[PDB]
Write a protein that binds this ligand. Structure first.
Ligand SMILES: [Zn+2]
Lengths: 136, 80, 288, 208, 198, 298
């Protein structure tokens, strides 16, 4: 799940001084490995988003989001692609008719879930409506 | 300059050679089919890479005018 | 009691019916060998990605008995670990299975021996001569809490969605529904729509019996329940299953494609039926 | 929900009028408890209705029936709410719109929730799915919110027929197809027995 | 090298280096410059000092200007590569056999870098690529075309918008093309059945 | 009691092994009973690899003229159909598997070998016949099974075959109808030559009591998978391919009418129906779903 930059502070306050170790650019594992997790979480929840509004969610200047997002595709940790003119990234969609098959199951399994809970909770009405199949 | 795709010069050169190459005995009777077929070839090779190309740039690049280029391409669209 | 019962979650599990049948063959065969019911034990394998876990195939494991404690002969597991890594090179070790009642001490001792092998071993248990009208196959996992100053192992139960593979689904549809001299005149549409016919019969059986409870609950006398009728409010309005301008376009996109294929296919049959007629005309009537 | 209507329902019977005037603000402002079937339908709270504790009674109906637009209409007749309660209503006010309209445009959710921008909307929707209320995704360029699944907040014994009728149309639909199959199945075999019979007449002509 | 076929220079400079290895070595210190320059411009080699006789003389502080470049070429680091040209100017840019092929070598990397950059993108600004490779827009625009001409970069240019839409839009092209054929055969088929009867 | 067959009488096997009614009559074994597990795992093994043919080993027993198949598993070999007897690569994993399997329960002996044929029917090629002839030569009671996974899907029912080869010397009797299946022309030649050298076996499918009772309890929640099935993008690269096959078969019979194997439009007509019959059947289950789940109103 996505982790905000206010829980980054919350959790940063809990840490010990030595645990915030910085390399090269002076950024922590926390402040980079965290916000990168935020993208991957946001990816499959969304299907597309602008960099301005994305960077606003992940608490960074858009330029950064755009760039690091590219890495996570490039290095091969999250499929997708970039449209720089627009300023949009496209995520794990897998949409169209494949979605239909899941949205059938999504509701069809709720029929079995609501079935089990009537067969369980009301075993009298289970025995009553039992022969509503047989007599019909 | 064809392969390097610097066409502004490529044809500039060739045009001024046409005067001498025509006077040649065996290179007179193919002075159109060659010279024109090269122009055509280059006109294809200039554009294909582009998805959208400015005609004004392509105009001076092929030693001609915008209006001329318009008709030039027109034929080539239909046929070529 | 030696199971968990708490606010679970953790991983999400799927279940292939091939796994159920490989255990079923293993129970019936080992039952038959000794002329009695047998607690057979074996290994689980399949795909593991992120949190979600699919169980694809399953095989057997060697077991002995030190006193009353079931000892998984691990030297056999490592031997079969060779041979299953060979054939299914993609697949991973996931858990194990057995038959009998619900979870109990004799399987917790075995679960410890699987815990030495891997850091997240799943556990299926099947009741062969079940009294349940439902399926007697439930999946569990290892969870550990403070039992009054004592850290100790428990079993948190989990649910299981069934597998979908089209090639597999037919295997289920063939043995669970056998053509034992039940199709004479080809028909084709009889041998296809038989699947949907009695499958939708199950859908109608379920959907109606819920609505029987809905009418009787408001009518009264049949116990009124807030926390069941609640889910029905969602269930019925959560329908209109995709009327999005995009979706139907895509649906019709497909239909037209299939239609094109029928138009060309019909021209082919016409073209043959034509040439069937042509040759018979161009020989009897015509002089070649 | 499930635990906090046994911890907070044990304390809903053994509680007077002022004990429930406090307890109503506890159960509402406590994430996980999005269902309000039991707590509103209790003999203890029904004496508070139209009494000295009537403000706290009207509030429990809003979360167990109404929406955010209804809260802003009744801003003084109800007690003042904090943001954490306004959010839980902004979750449930979408869940209602979601049950009806499954494909929601963005602008819609600025109106029914009186919100200021997408950034918020999204964030609030994040929390909605995060609290295991909804399922789905968004479409930024297209300005959409598709909803793969939503829970049902209300029980509604008022409109239990509104739940029943939608169920009947599906039961009808089940028959529509079931019989529709058996016709087409019996006809595809009949057209096979049409041709098989008609092809025996073609072959028997040759015997002459 | 002059002729272009670097596969016939590469091997030539290995054997000549070995003759200076046995006897005198006035050219051995500058002969390795042409063995390494070959392997880079061979556009494949990128493995000079791992060979045989170049192992103990890779350290040699004369040719160590070229040791920084072979890994910079191999790793495709341009800002590093061009820094070595500025500092070690006397070593590299005074030799007329390295001064000639300097830009052809710089391209071979420039393109290499660009391929990785664009891969994730579908649509991209030229002004950004300009800054990224650090180069004039026109020169980028030109270089882009060449890759497309020889057909390495799968992409096309919108000259008016100063960008690069990239090939990617992939779908079921098989169904339609396959059916196209079946449609054609039926066309020629049915006429052959008509030309039978009259 | 249904579990008459899941029993395994071991001493009865070795009396038949010595007796041999297969060295007396050349076409003795004619039937083939395939178990519940055997069918599923073989179908799963074929599709799992998918486009590529991969063979495994079957275990079973004999009874009357029926060659019963009880249990199956895979052989991690390569070059099925391209090598004569491709099981030679993993001679280790044949005996080593049965030695492990006999310790745990599978007492059944080597009964045959099975392979996948993705998108081109069930039959024995020239490479397959050379394998089976020599299999029957030494390792007797051995039956060669075939499955077509890609069509099993599109046709919508178990596409499977069980065959046995004849001797090189004695040649088969007359009684043989043999049903037609679309053979791609690239392969039609290979089939056509060695097709008459063997004979098929009458397939039948059985199940235990527990299997039967489990599958009925299983069906409580498996009806959901039937109405979200969609055999379209699943096996998209069979139907799109069969077109390429169909186009060629017409191309021949078109010129056959002209100048210049007997009327190859009658085949192509049956192929155009075969392939499209599937494509239509696909869109039956689609509209069935659009009717169901979409059309309720709010
Ligand atoms: Zn084969």
């Amino acid at each position: 799940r996505i982790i905000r930059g206010n829980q980054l502070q919350e959790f940063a306050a809990m840490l010990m001084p030595h645990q915030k170790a910085t390399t090269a650019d002076g950024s922590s594992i926390l402040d980079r490995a965290v916000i990168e997790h935020n993208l991957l979480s946001a990816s499959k929840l969304y299907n597309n988003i602008t960099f301005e509004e994305l960077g606003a969610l992940l608490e960074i200047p858009a330029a950064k989001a755009e760039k690091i997002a590219s890495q996570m595709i490039t290095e091969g940790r999250m499929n997708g692609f970039i449209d720089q003119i627009d300023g949009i990234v496209h995520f794990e969609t897998r949409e169209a008719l494949p979605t239909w098959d899941k949205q059938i199951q999504s509701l069809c399994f709720q029929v079995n879930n609501l079935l089990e809970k009537i067969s369980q909770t009301a075993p009298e009405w289970t025995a009553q409506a039992m022969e509503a199949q047989m007599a019909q | 300059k064809f392969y390097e795709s610097k066409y502004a010069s490529c044809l500039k050169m060739l045009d001024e050679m046409k005067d001498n190459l025509l006077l040649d005995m065996y290179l007179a009777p193919h002075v159109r089919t060659l010279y024109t077929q090269i122009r055509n070839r280059a006109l294809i090779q200039y554009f294909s890479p582009y998805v959208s190309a400015d005609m004004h740039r392509m105009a001076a690049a092929f030693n001609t005018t915008v209006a001329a280029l318009e008709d030039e391409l027109t034929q080539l669209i239909l046929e070529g | 009691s030696v199971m968990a019962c708490g606010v679970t979650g953790s991983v999400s599990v799927a279940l292939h019916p091939l796994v159920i049948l490989n255990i079923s063959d293993h129970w019936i065969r080992m039952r038959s060998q000794e002329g009695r019911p047998v607690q057979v034990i074996g290994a689980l394998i399949g795909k593991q990605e992120g949190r979600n876990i699919e169980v694809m195939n399953s095989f057997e494991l060697l077991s002995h008995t030190v006193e009353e404690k079931i000892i998984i002969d691990k030297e056999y597991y490592y031997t079969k670990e060779e041979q299953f890594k060979q054939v299914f090179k993609e697949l991973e070790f996931l858990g194990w299975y057995t038959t009998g009642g619900p979870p109990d001490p004799s399987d917790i001792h075995v679960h410890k021996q699987v815990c030495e092998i891997i850091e997240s071993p799943l556990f299926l248990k099947l009741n062969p001569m079940t009294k349940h009208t439902d399926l007697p196959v439930s999946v569990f996992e290892s969870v550990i809490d403070i039992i009054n100053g004592e850290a100790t192992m428990l079993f948190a139960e989990l649910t299981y969605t069934l597998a979908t593979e089209e090639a597999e689904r037919i295997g289920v549809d063939h043995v669970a529904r056998m053509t034992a001299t039940g199709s004479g005149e080809n028909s084709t549409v009889a041998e296809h729509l038989i699947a949907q016919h009695s499958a939708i019969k199950m859908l109608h059986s379920r959907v109606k019996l819920i609505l029987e409870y809905v009418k009787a609950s408001e009518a009264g006398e049949v116990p009124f329940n807030h926390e069941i009728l609640r889910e029905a409010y969602a269930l019925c309005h959560c329908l209109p299953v995709l009327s999005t301008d995009k979706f139907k376009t895509d649906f019709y996109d497909q239909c037209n494609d299939v239609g094109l294929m029928a138009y060309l296919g019909t021209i082919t049959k016409t073209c043959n039926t034509m040439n069937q007629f042509v040759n018979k005309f161009n020989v009897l009537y015509d002089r070649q | 929900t499930g635990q906090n209507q046994e911890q907070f329902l044990l304390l809903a019977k053994s509680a007077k009028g002022a004990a429930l005037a406090t307890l109503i603000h506890q159960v509402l402002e406590a994430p996980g408890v999005y269902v309000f079937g039991e707590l509103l339908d209790m003999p203890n709270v029904r004496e508070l209705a139209e009494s000295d504790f009537a403000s706290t009674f009207r509030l429990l109906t809003v979360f167990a029936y109404g929406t955010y637009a209804d809260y802003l209409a009744e801003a003084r007749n109800l007690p003042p709410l904090t943001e954490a309660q306004k959010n839980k209503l902004r979750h449930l006010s979408v869940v209602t719109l979601a049950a009806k309209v499954k494909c929601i445009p963005y602008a819609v959710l600025l109106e029914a929730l009186a919100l200021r921008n997408v950034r918020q909307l999204e964030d609030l929707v994040i929390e909605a799915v995060y609290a295991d209320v909804l399922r789905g995704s968004l479409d930024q360029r297209n300005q959409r919110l598709e909803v793969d699944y939503s829970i049902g907040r209300d029980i509604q014994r008022q409109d239990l027929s509104a739940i029943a009728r939608t169920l009947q149309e599906w039961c009808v639909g089940c028959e529509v197809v079931l019989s529709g199959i058996e016709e087409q199945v019996s006809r595809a075999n009949q057209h096979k027995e049409q041709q098989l019979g008609l092809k025996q007449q073609i072959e028997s002509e040759v015997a002459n | 090298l002059r002729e272009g076929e670097f596969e016939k220079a590469h091997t030539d400079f290995f054997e000549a280096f070995k003759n200076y290895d046995e006897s005198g070595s006035p050219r051995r210190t500058t002969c390795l410059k042409y063995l390494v320059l070959a392997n880079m411009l061979m556009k494949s080699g990128i493995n000079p000092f791992d060979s045989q006789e170049a192992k103990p003389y890779k350290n040699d502080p004369e040719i160590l200007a070229m040791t920084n470049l072979v890994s910079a070429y191999q790793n495709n680091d341009i800002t590093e590569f061009e820094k070595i040209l500025k500092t070690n100017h006397s070593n590299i840019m005074d030799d007329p056999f390295i001064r000639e092929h300097i830009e052809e070598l710089l391209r071979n990397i420039r393109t290499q870098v660009l391929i990785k950059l664009i891969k994730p993108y579908t649509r991209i600004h030229i002004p950004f690529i300009s800054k990224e490779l650090n180069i004039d827009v026109a020169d980028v625009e030109s270089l882009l075309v060449q890759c497309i001409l020889d057909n390495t970069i799968h992409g096309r240019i919108d000259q008016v918008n100063q960008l690069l839409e990239l090939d990617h839009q992939k779908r079921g092209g098989a169904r339609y093309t396959a059916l196209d054929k079946w449609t054609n055969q039926l066309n020629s088929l049915n006429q052959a059945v008509v030309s039978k009867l009259a | 009691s249904i579990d008459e067959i899941y029993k395994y009488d071991k001493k009865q096997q070795q009396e038949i092994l010595a007796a041999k009614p297969w060295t007396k009559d050349h076409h003795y074994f004619k039937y083939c009973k395939i178990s519940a597990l055997a069918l599923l795992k073989m179908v799963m093994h074929a599709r799992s690899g998918g486009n590529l043919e991969v063979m495994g080993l079957m275990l079973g027993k004999v009874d009357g003229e029926t060659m019963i198949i009880m249990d199956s598993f895979a052989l991690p070999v390569e070059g099925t159909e391209t090598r004569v007897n491709a099981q030679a690569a993993a001679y280790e994993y044949m005996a080593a598997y049965i030695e492990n399997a006999k310790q745990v329960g599978r007492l059944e002996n080597a009964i045959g070998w099975y392979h996948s044929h993705p998108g081109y029917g069930c039959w024995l090629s020239g490479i397959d016949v050379s394998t089976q002839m020599l299999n029957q030569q030494f390792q007797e009671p051995f039956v060669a099974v075939v499955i077509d996974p890609t069509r099993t899907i599109s046709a919508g029912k178990v596409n499977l075959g069980a065959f046995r080869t004849y001797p090189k010397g004695y040649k088969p009797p007359d009684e043989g109808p043999s049903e037609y299946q679309t053979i791609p022309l690239n392969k039609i030649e290979d089939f056509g030559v060695h097709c008459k050298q063997y004979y098929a076996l009458e397939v039948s499918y059985f199940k235990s009591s527990l299997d039967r009772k489990l599958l009925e309890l299983l069906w409580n929640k498996y009806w959901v998978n039937t109405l979200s099935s969609s055999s379209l993008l699943t096996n998209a690269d069979y139907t799109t391919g069969q077109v390429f096959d169909l186009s060629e078969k017409l191309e021949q019979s078109e010129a056959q009418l002209g100048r210049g194997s007997e009327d190859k439009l009658a085949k192509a007509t049956r192929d155009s129906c075969k392939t499209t019959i599937e494509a239509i059947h696909g869109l039956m289950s689609q509209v069935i779903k659009d009717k169901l789940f979409n059309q309720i109103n709010i």
